């Protein structure tokens, strides 16, 4: 029956086009959450860049500390030497 | 009319094909959403690491200040001894 | 006997049950060994959504059969 068959096919087209809309809406939501995640991943790249600078700072501070150790050992020797000489009188 | 159903026939197949295409794309974005979220797990580890690097810098600063005072003491002990001996 | 539950992830889980086991007993077993809550599980075999209250012999589920797990 052409009447029933064309009523049937018509209603399916409407269901399919409604689903197309529904699925596209779903995609719109996930595209939004994808973008938010991308922003959060931008912060991760900076977090990495930050921590690598913190290492550079630690080593600069280590280097400073080592230098004072070399200076302090110098003074301890100059002091020890001077004490021997002062016991020569 | 037969031709009028040629219309509906061709459109239904076109719409059903589009649904298939859109769902494949949807599956791909579900894939990247999950993959990205896995990578966001790493961020909690990066932050914790940055905090240990920060504490380490402060520990080394503290060490540097300590040794700085030790050297200043010795530099003082030297000045006294040279001043007295330089009388 | 043994059966196979096929997820849409490509993972196939094996279960040891009896045909007197209610469909609630098998969805509890699925949760116990993979964690998925029962309220999200929807089991299909022979193109039938399996009823909690029914048993495996209700649907004539014999050994080595394969069910289909869909999450909602």
């Amino acid at each position: 029956p052409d009447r029933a068959v064309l009523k049937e096919l018509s209603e399916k087209l409407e269901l399919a086009e409604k689903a197309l809309a529904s699925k596209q809406l779903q995609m719109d939501e996930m595209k939004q959450t994808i973008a938010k995640q991308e922003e959060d991943l931008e912060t991760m790249t900076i977090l990495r860049a930050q921590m690598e600078v913190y290492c550079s700072d630690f080593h600069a501070e280590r280097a400073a500390r080592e230098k004072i150790h070399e200076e302090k050992e110098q003074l301890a020797l100059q002091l020890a030497v001077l004490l021997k000489e002062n016991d020569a009188f | 009319d037969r031709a009028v159903l040629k219309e509906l026939s061709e459109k239904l197949e076109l719409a059903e094909k589009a649904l298939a295409s859109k769902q494949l794309q949807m599956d791909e974005m579900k894939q990247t959403i999950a993959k990205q979220e896995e990578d966001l797990e790493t961020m909690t580890i990066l932050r914790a690491q940055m905090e240990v690097y920060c504490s380490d810098f402060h520990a080394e600063r503290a060490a540097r200040e300590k040794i700085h005072e030790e050297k200043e003491q010795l530099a003082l002990q030297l000045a006294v001894l040279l001043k007295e001996n330089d009388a | 006997m043994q059966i196979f539950v096929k997820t849409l992830t490509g993972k196939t889980i094996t279960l040891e049950v009896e045909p007197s086991d209610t469909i609630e007993n098998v969805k509890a077993k699925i949760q116990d060994k993979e964690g998925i809550p029962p309220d999200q599980q929807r089991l299909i075999f022979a193109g039938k959504q399996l009823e909690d209250g029914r048993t495996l012999s209700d649907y004539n589920i014999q050994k080595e059969s394969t069910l289909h797990l869909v999450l909602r």
Partner: peptide, 27 residues
């Protein structure tokens, strides 16, 4: 009338998405 290519679940001839996973018949 037709069985989904994903869950192998059977859907009605009029069904456009699978009633179970909500996937297109041709997916």
């Amino acid at each position: 009338r037709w069985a989904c290519q994903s869950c192998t679940f059977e859907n009605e001839a009029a069904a456009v998405l699978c009633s179970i996973c909500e996937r297109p018949r041709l997916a």
